[PDB]
Amino acid sequence: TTLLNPYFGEFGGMYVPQILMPALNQLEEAFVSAQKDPEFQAQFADLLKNYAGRPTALTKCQNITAGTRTTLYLKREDLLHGGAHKTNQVLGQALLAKRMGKSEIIAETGAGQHGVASALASALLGLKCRIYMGAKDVERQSPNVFRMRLMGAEVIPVHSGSATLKDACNEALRDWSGSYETAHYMLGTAAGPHPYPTIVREFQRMIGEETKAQILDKEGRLPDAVIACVGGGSNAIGMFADFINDTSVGLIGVEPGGHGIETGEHGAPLKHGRVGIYFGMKAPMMQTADGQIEESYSISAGLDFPSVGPQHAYLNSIGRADYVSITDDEALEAFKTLCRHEGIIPALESSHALAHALKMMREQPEKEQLLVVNLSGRGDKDIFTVHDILKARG
Amino acid sequence: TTLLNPYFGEFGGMYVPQILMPALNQLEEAFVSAQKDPEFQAQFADLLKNYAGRPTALTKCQNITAGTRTTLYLKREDLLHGGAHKTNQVLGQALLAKRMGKSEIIAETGAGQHGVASALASALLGLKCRIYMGAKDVERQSPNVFRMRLMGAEVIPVHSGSATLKDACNEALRDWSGSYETAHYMLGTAAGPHPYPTIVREFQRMIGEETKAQILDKEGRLPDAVIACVGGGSNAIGMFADFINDTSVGLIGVEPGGHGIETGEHGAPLKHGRVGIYFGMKAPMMQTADGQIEESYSISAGLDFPSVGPQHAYLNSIGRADYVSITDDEALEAFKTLCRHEGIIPALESSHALAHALKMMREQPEKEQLLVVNLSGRGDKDIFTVHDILKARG
Amino acid sequence: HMERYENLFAQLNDRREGAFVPFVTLGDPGIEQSLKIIDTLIDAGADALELGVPFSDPLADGPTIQNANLRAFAAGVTPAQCFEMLALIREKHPTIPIGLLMYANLVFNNGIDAFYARCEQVGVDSVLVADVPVEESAPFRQAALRHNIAPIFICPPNADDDLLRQVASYGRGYTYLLSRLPLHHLIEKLKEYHAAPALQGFGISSPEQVSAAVRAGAAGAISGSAIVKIIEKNLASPKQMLAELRSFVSAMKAASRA
Amino acid sequence: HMERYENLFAQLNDRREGAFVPFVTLGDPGIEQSLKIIDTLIDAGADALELGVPFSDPLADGPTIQNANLRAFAAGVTPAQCFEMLALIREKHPTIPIGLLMYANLVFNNGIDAFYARCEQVGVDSVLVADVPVEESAPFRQAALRHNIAPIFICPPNADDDLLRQVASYGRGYTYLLSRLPLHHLIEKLKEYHAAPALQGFGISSPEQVSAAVRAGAAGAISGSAIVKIIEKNLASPKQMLAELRSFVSAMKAASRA
Ligand SMILES: *Cc1c(COP(=O)(O)O)cnc(C)c1O
Ligand SMILES: *Cc1c(COP(=O)(O)O)cnc(C)c1O
Ligand SMILES: [Cl-]
Ligand SMILES: [Cl-]
Ligand SMILES: [Cl-]
Ligand SMILES: [Cs+]
Ligand SMILES: [Cs+]
Q1: H-helix or E-strand spanning residue C238
Q2: Minimum distance, in Å, between the CA of residue C50 and any CA atom of chain A
Q3: Residue identifier of the C-alpha nearest atom 1 of ligand 1
Q4: Assigned domain for B119 exists
Q5: Considering B204, B239, B257, which residue would you say is the last residue of a domain?
Q6: Which residues carry this modification: N6-(pyridoxal phosphate)lysine (chains A, B)?
Q7: Chains in contact with chain B (at least 3 beta-carbon pairs closer than 8 A)
Q8: Which domain holds residue B316?
Q9: Which of A87, A88, A235, A345 has most ligand 1 atoms within 8 Å of its beta carbon, as the pocket-test mutant?
Q10: Which residues contact D241 (CB under 8 A, 6 or more apart)?
Q11: Residue C38 needs a FRET pair 20 to 30 A away by CA distance; which of A5, A332, B36, C146 works?
Q12: Is residue B284 a part of any domain in this protein?
């Protein structure tokens, strides 16, 4: 028994050990109650406006589209406090934990951005925060783990499995199953067991709500398409949500194509994986022919989640949203283009979305089209990566 | 002959080679005309709102002041595009260059932030940008110089003199004196020859104008004091300007105290230097008993300017503003405090302002006081610095 | 239907005994060594077996079992190789009940129904799907019954009465009890609701706890990690590993005669 | 008042000659070597001297002079040591006009008036303050006149007529002309406005340009960096440095007799 539907068509559900089901049911009932609480809605909006910087800008890129009939806008989630859209929903979830009378936060993180976002929300709201991180990711993201520790978070390395994100996700669930009375598991994407896909969307949907109001203000019409990268699906569903019922508005999600789909070294399970059951959900995933979960490769570490939110798999199967992929090289080229022609350093994650928008533009340059790209983060964390690849050639 | 007063009391002026005077007079007349042009004002505000993220938030810090009668707000210039307040005035100056029909930008930079800000403004507005940087600073700020190059700027090392900021400032002036017909010198602080102190203030004064409107909204009254770090004076005069005629509002500027004023290794010329003539202005400066200009020491590279804006020296001498200093260790402690209790990583520059606010609070904890600290930048660029110092001990 | 759990619990109740069920990971630390390990467990007095299939992401298992999975993966153990072990085990031991601890994806991968058909063909008696709650169990337990497999469900210590009723109604073979809300309440309520016999599997590591679980009313005890610990400690000497395995199991099983 | 520029330009006009004025940095590359350098410049035929004091931030100087300043700082040259050199130079050469190229801060440091008093005491004839425009020159030129020092002002190539009038009215000794807006216009307008005699100092590096500046109407030429280049090239051999210095200056000075 649940108050909300845990499935999006065939996708989603609550595939957790029985001991975790009370935790999920308590979380759903608090969330449903919080959603109807005008005082919760006002504190949430307050933190978003006065602590995080919302509403974010909608920037028109005139240099990048010159000579074509494409009009490109960027939803500037890179200007959010923390440098990425993740801050929206950790603020919501941390308020949810306080509503449930909890004083502790559990989180996992791969590239480090969700751990930094969980740590800053926990520091602001007076919550003790422990973060599980794969040891190989701990070694690779020494800046982000120092950020977490500076903000008072306890960072716990995870050496089991492959020692990456999915193995961190396992160790957080185990923690929560024994500690959910005092601790809230702050899941960092729009995936996992219900109600997390629904919760993360509703706490990210101001992205699309603002974009709609801003695009109507500046252009008098809805966009022809909104485009967002898809790692776990949170920033994309945040952009998509308020446009789902505007049928004339295309919804395009961009998975990492890695070295190329045909190489096997990619992170695009929605279109090139296979339906599976892992991390509390039924969703397409990166799995062997046996059923063992593999990792997702991308030059952009924040797209490393080996599965995808179940609402995206559902939106694909009914044809409401379309999903594509963009390779490392395509994303890098889009990274350099935005820097040189708009003075904006995008996260390599968001460079996948922009790279597809540039392809839509460049392939059909006389097509009249109004595009909004969700710029989910800034890319200062990526300049060292881009530097190495670019001098590896010349 | 000038349209505006080049002096603030005894401080300021236009001490440049005669060949540069036409450049300054042309710049003053364009600026005066731009200021009366409603279309210039609307394009400037547009870029600030839709490209840079303005207005920035005003965050109330409740955790940091608990147990005292201090109410602390932070003006969040760290949420501005680029990560620092510098973006405001390079956008204004780049529009001024376009107004004058110029297609090229000259800039100098020390820590790299003004060079990155000049490069992003030049990329956005279609201007060719060359940046002079001291070779010792070029070696120390490899991230920021790569940012500049990614954004299409040409970075020219300066090996003359001490090969730091002041030697970069010299090499830009020489460039401009021969190239001012096509190039605009984009000075990066509220100092140098007139009209640059006046121009940089007017292009930074929205900081204080927004703070006034936001503090009246949230508290129904003006602040007891606004506090800002003083490297060259641009972020502080930006905060101060709209409060100068509200006499009941204290204005506190914070110079870097370095290892300590008594050590000689500091960067506080306004209070512990001596009036001099350099960089086109009469102002207090870091100089030997002979008159040779020395460097300013600070743990925070962005406070390295060896002099100070002439309006600050004037505001000090009439007692309108008060200026203090904060040591490296005091600033570091404030850096760690903001991270752990508010989840905000401040620039080590802005940590000087916050550190003085914390001192005002902690010294007299029963004093009722409403403080606004200008948080001029984010501090991700400083985590490696803070990491080294903190493990150098334990 | 061969009724192996039912026949065992009959034989055990007729002799006033409790069941002892050890857990091991199939292929840990190697296929041939695992087969010897399981043969010495059965010879030492195990009443039934719970066998795990190495899964890449065992989000419901502690560190001891996590390391067992990696030792089996380091040996190149696959699900197909496990079902080859299961057939060889059943062919040596026709009577012992063999249960599987599975993760949902290995069951769902090639089709739920085909997985339970393969269990029936190799002689498996029960399937616990570690990450399937009763709320999601409908396709799994229905496929298990269609193929004469008993679906095993965990009864957590917090279980309210509606969960108790579902566990009693949905389960077969035995009820996996994690307990010592009152322990005697859960065991009596499960009997009240005609549940499958309850086996205690919380922290069963000593003969004394096997004895305590039976007195509490449970029909036996499952040792969840203690057997896997003995393997991990004696990796350098497979000979002493089996002796310590035979010594421990005989201790636990004799603790169930009273 | 000793009227050294006036007496020189008299002696030069009575013999249909133009002036040649070399620039060097005081103390470059060392105090003793600099003193020899200046003695061989005067002996080779220099009519007057322009002497720079090493300043830490010469924002109005090209790279050749920037390196000269660092060679003098590397020798530990201070403003006080320069004024000791100036006294020794004047004591050896009573007639030659000695001008200083200063930066504003070294003049302002201990008080403007006291700086010009020290110039008068050591025998300095003129002061060009490189970073003081005529618009800011009031305290400087007034102090210079009170102490019998001629304030020198640069006339840039772009100079409109109001700048020309100020330069003519404010300057003494000579006008520092950077030129070849029409060159003959500036020289005639400066004469029209009774300016001090104009010396050309743009790119004076060959005998041919010294000859061209005089024909254009200017009273002579200042070699801004050519002398400093010869020093920098012959650092390894101070002996050959002086010979190349004596050869060059005699070339430039003979170019001014016609
Ligand atoms: C985390 C990350 C992503 C991927 O996360 P989603 O859940 O797919 O939104 C995308 N962009 C940035 C900047 C990220 O940090
Ligand atoms: C540049 C810098 C400063 C110092 O510059 P001002 O002209 O004094 O404002 C202060 N804070 C930050 C973040 C800076 O980058
Ligand atoms: Cl266009
Ligand atoms: Cl904003
Ligand atoms: Cl308070
Ligand atoms: Cs993915
Ligand atoms: Cs300063």
Answers
A1: helix C238-257
A2: 17
A3: A302
A4: yes
A5: B204
A6: 86
A7: A, D
A8: 53-85+205-390
A9: A235
A10: D37, D230, D231, D234, D235
A11: C146
A12: yes
Say if residue A183 is in the same domain as residue A265.
Answer: no
CATH of the domain at A118: 3.40.50.1100
Domain check: are A344 and A378 in the same one? yes
What order of strands is seen across the sheet that includes strand B104-109? B154-158, B128-134, B104-109, B183-185
D1 touches chain B (CB under 8 A): no
Where in the sequence is the domain holding C124, given as residue range(s)? 1-258
Distance, in Å, from the CA atom of A16 to the CA atom of A281, rounded to the nearest integer, reads 8
Q: In chain D, count of helices (H) and strands (E)?
A: 12, 9
DSSP 8-state class, residue A102: -
Q: How far is D14 from chain B (nearest CA, A)?
A: 33
Same domain, A184 and A43: yes
Bond prior to C207 in cis (omega within 30° of 0) = no
Q: A233 and A133, same structural domain?
A: no
Question: Distance (Å, rounded) from C-alpha B23 to C-alpha B280?
Answer: 13
Which approach determined this entry?
Answer: X-ray
Give, rounded to a whole angstrom, the gap between the first and last alpha carbons of chain B: 60
Pair (B67, B131) in one structural domain: no
To test the contact with chain C by mutation, choose from A170, A277, A282, A293 the residue with the greatest count of C C-beta atoms within 10 A, namely A277
Q: How many domains does the structure of chain C reveal?
A: 1
Q: Is the dihedral of CA A305, A310, A311, A312 positive or negative?
A: positive
Q: How far apart are the CA of C83 and the nearest CA of chain A, in angstroms?
A: 13
Number of structural domains (chain B) is 2
Mutate to test the pocket of ligand 2, among B235, B296, B352 (most ligand atoms within 8 A of CB): B235
Q: Do D55 and B292 touch (CB under 8 A)?
A: yes
What is the SS3 string spanning chain B?
A: CCCCCCEECCEEEEECCHHHHHHHHHHHHHHHHHHCCHHHHHHHHHHHHHHCCCCCCEEEECCCCCCCCEEEEEEEHHHCCCCECHHHHHHHHHHHHHHCCCCEEEEEECCCHHHHHHHHHHHHHCCEEEEEEEHHHHHHCHHHHHHHHHCCCEEEEECCCCCCHHHHHHHHHHHHHHHCCCEEECCCCCCCCCCHHHHHHHCCCHHHHHHHHHHHHHHCCCCCEEEEECCCCHHHHHHHHHHCCCCCCEEEEEEEEECCHHHCCCCCHHHHCEEEEECEEEEEECECCCCCECCCCCCCHHHCCCECCHHHHHHHHCCCCEEEEEEHHHHHHHHHHHHHHHCCCECHHHHHHHHHHHHHHHHCCCCCEEEEEEECEECHHHHHHHHHHHHCCC
Q: Which of B52, B81, B343 sits opposite A124 (nearest CB)?
A: B343
Distance, CA of C194 to CA of C170 (rounded, Å): 11
Among residues B155, B174, B204, which one ends one of the domains?
Answer: B204
A190 and A244 share a domain? no
- In sequence order, the 6+-apart residues with CB closer than 8 A to the CB of A390 are A332
One domain for residues B34 and B183: yes
In a domain, B3, yes or no: no
Query: What is the residue whose two structure tokens read 């009249």?
Result: A368
Task: Spell C35-45 as b/e; 16+ CB within 10 A means b.
Answer: bebbebbbebb
Q: Residue B260 corresponds to which amino acid?
A: G
Chain centroid to CA C78? 19
Domain co-membership, B377 together with B306? yes
CB A272 within 8 A of CB A296: no
Cβ contacts of A56 on chain B, cutoff 8 Å: 53
A85 CA to middle of ligand 1, Å? Answer: 7
- Active site annotation includes B339: no
- The amino acid at residue D77 is V
Residue type, A308: V
| Contacts with A383 from chain B: Cβ below 8 Å | 143, 146-147, 150
Of the candidates C6, C61, C131, C135, the residue annotated as catalytic is C61
What is the C-alpha to C-alpha distance for residues B62 and B56, in angstroms, rounded to an integer?
19
Contact state of A152 with B339 under an 8 Å Cβ cutoff: yes
